[PDB]
Amino acid sequence: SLFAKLGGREAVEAAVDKFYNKIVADPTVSTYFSNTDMKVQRSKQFAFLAYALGGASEWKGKDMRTAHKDLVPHLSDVHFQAVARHLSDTLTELGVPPEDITDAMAVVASTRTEVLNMPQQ
Ligand code: HEM
Numbered sequence: 001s002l003f004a005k006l007g008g009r010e011a012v013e014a015a016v017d018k019f020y021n022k023i024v025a026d027p028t029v030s031t032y033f034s035n036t037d038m039k040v041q042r043s044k045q046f047a048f049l050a051y052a053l054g055g056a057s058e059w060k061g062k063d064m065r066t067a068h069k070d071l072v073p074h075l076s077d078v079h080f081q082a083v084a085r086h087l088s089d090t091l092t093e094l095g096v097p098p099e100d101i102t103d104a105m106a107v108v109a110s111t112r113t114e115v116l117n118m119p120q121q
Pocket residue numbers: 028029032033035036037041044045048049061062063067068071075079080083084108111115
C-alpha cells in the first residue's frame with residue numbers, strides 16, 4: 001500500500017507533524033486552526049491519512065464534508081491548494097520519491113469535492 005511504501009507509521013507521523021508546522025505558519029490557513037488542538041489534529045490527520053493511504057481499514061472520524069463545510073470563511077481552492085502544496089513540500093523534504101509524492105497527492109486530491117463542500121455534480 002501507499003502507506004507502507006511511504007515508510008509506514010513512522011514516516012507518516014513525521015509527515016503529519018512537519019506538515020502542521022507549516023500550516024500554523026501560513027496566514028492563508030493558520031487562522032482556521034486558531035481554536036484547534038494541534039496535537040489532537042495531528043492525531044486525527046494521521047488516522048485519516050493512514051486509512052486514505054491504505055494503512056488502516058477504517059476511518060471513524062467525521063466525513064470530510066462534515067468536517068470542513070461549516071468553516072469560515074468558506075473553503076475555496078486557494079486554501080485547498082495551500083494545504084496540498086504544504087503536504088507536497090513536506091514529503092519532498094522527508095525524502096520521498098517523486099513518484100510516491102504523485103500518488104499521495106492524488107489521494108489528497110480525491111478528497112477535494114467533499115472537503116470543499118462542493119456540488120457533486
Ligand atoms: C486538503 C485535504 C484535507 C484533508 C485530507 C483534511 C483532513 C482533515 C481531518 C482528518 C480532519 C479531522 C476531522 C474530524 O474531526 O474527524 C479535518 C478537520 C479540520 N480541517 Fe481539514 N483536511 C483537508 C483540508 C483542509 C483545509 C484546506 C483546511 C483550511 C484551510 C482545513 C482545516 C480544518 C479544520 C479547521 C478542521 C477542524 C479542526 C478542529 O476540529 O478544531 N482542512 N481535516
